[PDB]
Amino acid sequence: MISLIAALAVDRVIGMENAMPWNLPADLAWFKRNTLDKPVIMGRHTWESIGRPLPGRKNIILSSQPGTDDRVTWVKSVDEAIAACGDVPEIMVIGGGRVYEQFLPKAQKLYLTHIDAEVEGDTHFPDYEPDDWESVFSEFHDADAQNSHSYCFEILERR
Amino acid sequence: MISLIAALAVDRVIGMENAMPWNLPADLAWFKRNTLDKPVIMGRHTWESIGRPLPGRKNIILSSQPGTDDRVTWVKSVDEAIAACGDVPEIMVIGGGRVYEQFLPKAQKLYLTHIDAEVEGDTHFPDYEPDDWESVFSEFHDADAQNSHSYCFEILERR
Ligand SMILES: NC(=O)c1ccc[n+]([C@@H]2O[C@H](COP(=O)([O-])OP(=O)(O)OC[C@H]3O[C@@H](n4cnc5c(N)ncnc54)[C@H](OP(=O)(O)O)[C@@H]3O)[C@@H](O)[C@H]2O)c1
Ligand SMILES: Nc1nc(=O)c2nc(CNc3ccc(C(=O)N[C@@H](CCC(=O)O)C(=O)O)cc3)cnc2[nH]1
Numbered sequence: 001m002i003s004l005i006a007a008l009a010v011d012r013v014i015g016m017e018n019a020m021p022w023n024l025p026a027d028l029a030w031f032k033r034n035t036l037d038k039p040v041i042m043g044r045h046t047w048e049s050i051g052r053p054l055p056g057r058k059n060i061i062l063s064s065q066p067g068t069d070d071r072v073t074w075v076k077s078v079d080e081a082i083a084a085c086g087d088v089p090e091i092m093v094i095g096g097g098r099v100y101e102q103f104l105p106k107a108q109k110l111y112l113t114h115i116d117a118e119v120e121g122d123t124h125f126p127d128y129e130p131d132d133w134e135s136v137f138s139e140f141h142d143a144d145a146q147n148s149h150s151y152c153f154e155i156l157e158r159r
Numbered sequence: 160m161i162s163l164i165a166a167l168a169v170d171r172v173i174g175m176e177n178a179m180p181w182n183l184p185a186d187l188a189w190f191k192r193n194t195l196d197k198p199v200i201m202g203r204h205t206w207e208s209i210g211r212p213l214p215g216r217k218n219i220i221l222s223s224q225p226g227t228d229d230r231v232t233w234v235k236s237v238d239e240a241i242a243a244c245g246d247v248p249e250i251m252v253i254g255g256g257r258v259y260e261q262f263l264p265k266a267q268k269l270y271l272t273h274i275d276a277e278v279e280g281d282t283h284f285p286d287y288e289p290d291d292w293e294s295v296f297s298e299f300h301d302a303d304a305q306n307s308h309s310y311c312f313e314i315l316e317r318r
């Protein structure tokens with residue numbers, strides 16, 4: 001199945017120019033925890049933000065222009081993306097905006113983190129019709145000495 | 160010697176209720192880089208913020224009360240904090256306010272990170288007199304895809 005994972009600030013802003021200004025170790029653990037041993041799909045831009053291959057996962061990068069690293073798989077199309085993943089029970093799409101818009105129509109599930117941060121950013125998470133997705137898990141956390149803002153993890157399944 | 164290391168937002172603000180709303184991996188790496196294999200002294204509140212001892216370093220913590228973790232070393236005063244360090248070339252002071260404030264007087268060096276971030280806080284770094292310190296290292300970095308704010312590393316040695 002195809003799945004998207006992302007953390008969204010208020011307005012669904014997923015990103016800007018530089019790193020999002022927040023510190024959420026608790027979010028990273030969820031991300032890492034849900035990506036574990038699953039192939040991840042990302043957009044060129046996102047990779048650059050990451051900078052190194054996620055360990056223990058197969059990294060597939062989308063881009064119209066050839067590879068710039070050996071540690072990763074480079075593909076030219078969503079179909080090739082998928083294919084390069086082969087038989088796996090779950091496919092993880094990690095970003096960014098362009099990639100999410102592409103895959104959203106194909107995802108069976110969403111792993112969203114909703115952050116209580118209001119930021120000015122240029123990239124957003126695609127719109128998802130409430131009625132087309134079932135919430136099947138949700139869990140909120142306030143901000144603490146370790147996490148800059150409150151957040152709430154959410155799991156939705158395509159109705 | 161004793162050295163203070165801290166990351167400061169504008170106005171010398173170093174702390175608030177929750178975690179500082181920034182993401183500066185490079186800063187973190189510089190923290191690690193300058194404190195590894197060296198004794199680290201911090202105050203109780205700061206310990207609660209780290210929530211696990213720092214690896215590869217000797218962790219000492221100040222508190223008027225008995226400790227709550229068998230993993231680190233607890234001291235009742237400054238003098239104990241020091242002595243528990245044992246003969247060492249450099250001792251690192253890592254926060255917070257009260258601690259900095261007590262120790263700044265015996266410091267022969269500061270490791271600062273001046274972060275281009277304007278945040279409202281309630282804890283600050285004490286004042287230092289440049290007439291007192293000689294800057295001996297400086298290096299600024301712009302915000303990027305990994306770091307949320309521009310930041311500048313600075314090393315000052317007492318005059
Ligand atoms: N930005 C940075 O570079 C940086 C570095 C460090 C910290 N910080 C921040 O600094 C803040 C913590 O600062 P803070 O001033 O509130 O607290 P702090 O210095 O971390 O904690 C002080 C506490 O340690 C104990 N203490 C201090 N001096 C003592 C002494 N002489 N004898 C015995 N116990 C002593 C007391 O513990 P008891 O109450 O248990 O007696 C006191 O409540 C946070 O918000 C944190 O995030 C930032
Ligand atoms: N919840 C959620 N949070 C995010 O921050 C997020 N980020 C992406 C894409 N960006 C990134 C940026 C950095 C790292 C990263 O370091 N990944 C690590 C965490 C390592 C750590 O534990 O320090 C990983 O190991 O998966 C991952 C994804 C996609 N979905 C998200 N989903």
Ligand SMILES: Nc1nc(=O)c2nc(CNc3ccc(C(=O)N[C@@H](CCC(=O)O)C(=O)O)cc3)cnc2[nH]1
Binds near residue numbers: 165213214253271272
């Ligand atoms: N320059 C500077 N930057 C800071 O962020 C800073 N933070 C503290 C105290 N609070 C903390 C909070 C977290 C960690 C911490 O996670 N340190 C890890 C880095 C692990 C990682 O790289 O993610 C360590 O190994 O030191 C350290 C100190 C003290 N001096 C500072 N000094």
